Design a binder for this molecule. Sequence first.
Ligand SMILES: Nc1nc2c(ncn2[C@@H]2O[C@@H]3COP(=O)(O)O[C@H]4[C@@H](O)[C@H](n5cnc6c(=O)[nH]c(N)nc65)O[C@@H]4COP(=O)(O)O[C@H]3[C@H]2O)c(=O)[nH]1
Lengths: 171, 170
Amino acid sequence: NVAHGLAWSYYIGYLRLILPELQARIRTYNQHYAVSQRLYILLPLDCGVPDNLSMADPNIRFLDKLPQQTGDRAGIKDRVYSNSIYELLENGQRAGTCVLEYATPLQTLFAMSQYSQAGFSREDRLEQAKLFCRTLEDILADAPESQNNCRLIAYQEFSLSQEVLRHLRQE
Amino acid sequence: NVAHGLAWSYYIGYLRLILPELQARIRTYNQHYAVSQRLYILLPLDCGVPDNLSMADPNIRFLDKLPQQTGDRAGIKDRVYSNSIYELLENGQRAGTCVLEYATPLQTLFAMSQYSQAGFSREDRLEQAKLFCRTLEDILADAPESQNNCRLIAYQEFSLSQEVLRHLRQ
Ligand SMILES: Nc1nc2c(ncn2[C@@H]2O[C@@H]3COP(=O)(O)O[C@H]4[C@@H](O)[C@H](n5cnc6c(=O)[nH]c(N)nc65)O[C@@H]4COP(=O)(O)O[C@H]3[C@H]2O)c(=O)[nH]1
């Protein structure tokens, strides 16, 4: 079972650290340059994770980078954590701005697919994706750092933008 | 068992992406500003991974940051990848300079030992450490990216400085 460890490292190595200081980073960018106060993580269950968000959906267009977050991490002095802000256009009109990004471990699960000495097969990507989404939301349920600082966007394959709009419109 | 997947994550999400551009980054630092041409990966099997190499061994001293590496990954525009270069003093005398860092997954295995939903338990974090290093060693052996662009340093506790210096000498 690979997805279990990837969900935990994703929380132990990233979410536990940037979420407590995310609200302050969004606040700092709003005063200098109306993004919502939440990190939205795309987790396609197909694990079709492209590197460019605009390449996946034309409606999803990059807006600007969040103020970097630094920190000494495992012998790396001032390791920079980067978060990208995106605006979502529907029918040529922007309807929401947010800090949007994919769940990178899913990209890793998709690539681990191809290799020979990977644990899981190439036909178990989907259940691994389903196992990652369940384990992450299980962790973020009992996680004291996730004080409604992020929301999980899980879907199966289409309009990605309006799935994103559905959640931000909720806020 | 979790140590197998995080060795694959360490290789797929980091090493396979930075090792190919490692020597070009060391050469840039060297000409514009005597750093080694390999990335040194400390692998403490105790799993006691501190955030500051400073404090684990005073002789290991942080001097400068390697030139950044950026790239678009998983929807983050130009994601920053940071590497730190250290000086290692031997009896008050600098003996080597290299890009030195810990294996972050080992720090995560230690942290997960505490959490209940994590598969392994406290007693198991040591076996996972050696298991992570083994898996990473097998992956690098068949890794086209690993043109010996990095060296793994496994050590069970003491002078970390010496353990590092032994390898750099060779
Ligand atoms: N959006 C975003 N997400 C982040 C960032 N840093 C970590 N994450 C997420 O958290 C996972 C685990 O991070 P890790 O514990 O540092 O475990 C990392 C770490 O050990 C190594 N690594 C990744 N990036 C860097 C880096 O910039 N510097 C160093 N020294 N190591 C890195 O590779 C492992 C796996 O990397 P990933 O596949 O990327 O998997 C990463 C990624 O999904 C970030 O700056 N931005």
